[PDB]
């Protein structure tokens, strides 16, 4: 995507919120931005916490959400304004309500502008609202999983990515990551015990996409073969892109 060093960028900590909903998204010497999200069906609720790290009160504290044209048609975001005055040492909360319309790839950008000590401060950070947040885990017996896996005929609906692992292959962490990703983590479906099989329905207003995922660790090459088989080619592609960056 964007070339150049990603430090002090709009996506420094973006990847950290694909499988978890709580934590600090951004922090400079004046402001700390924390998050707490909750999702259900094709909806979500993201609490954004703005902490004033100084002994001085912030003014004109202004957070705004920015979405590209395509993203607009696939994702709907709503939020109530927060008080523009933030006491030094104080923390203020903002709630963002989410509704997924259709599968999407782009991410919303949160822009924050405010005054401190009489100076204009500007921050832009990508908000971690990703397609997987709208997963309904679907537990199912092995037999049912394979029947569904073999119902795929359109080659474009299958997307495979073979990539190098970025983190250790710590089983419980990977399980937590997959569970955190959203789908159900089906136990004992793939005869290969090292493989992870997930099944879920990506819920969007306009279409429910049945998703089956197979994550095949390659311990030696420290790579994974991720296969997404879903009822929609673009969903297969995006879920593949996202999950790929997580291991």
């Amino acid at each position: 995507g964007s070339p150049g060093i990603r430090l002090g960028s709009s996506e420094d900590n973006f990847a950290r919120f694909v499988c978890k909903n709580n934590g600090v998204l951004f922090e400079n010497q004046l402001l700390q931005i924390g998050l707490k999200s909750e999702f259900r069906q094709n909806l979500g609720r993201m609490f954004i916490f703005y902490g004033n790290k100084t002994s001085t009160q912030f003014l004109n504290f202004t957070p705004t959400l920015i979405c590209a044209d395509d993203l607009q048609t696939n994702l709907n975001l709503q939020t109530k304004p927060v008080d523009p005055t933030v006491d030094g040492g104080a923390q203020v909360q903002q709630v963002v309500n989410i509704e997924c319309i259709s599968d999407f790839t782009e991410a919303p950008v949160l822009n924050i502008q405010f005054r401190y000590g009489g100076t204009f401060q500007n921050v832009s950070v990508k908000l971690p609202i990703t397609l997987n947040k709208f997963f309904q885990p679907t537990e199912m017996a092995s037999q049912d999983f394979f029947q569904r896996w073999k119902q795929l005929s359109n080659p474009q609906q299958e997307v495979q990515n073979i990539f190098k692992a970025k983190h250790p292959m710590d089983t419980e962490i990977t399980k937590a990551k997959i569970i955190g990703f959203g789908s159900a983590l089906l136990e004992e479906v793939d005869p290969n015990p090292a493989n992870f099989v997930g099944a879920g329905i990506i819920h969007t207003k306009t279409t429910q996409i049945g998703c089956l995922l197979r994550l095949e660790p390659n311990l030696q090459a420290q790579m994974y073969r991720l296969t997404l088989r879903t009822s929609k080619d673009t969903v297969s592609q995006r879920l593949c892109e996202l999950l790929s960056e997580q291991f």
Partner: peptide
């Protein structure tokens, strides 16, 4: 053997 193909 492998139910994935």
């Amino acid at each position: 053997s492998d139910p994935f193909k």
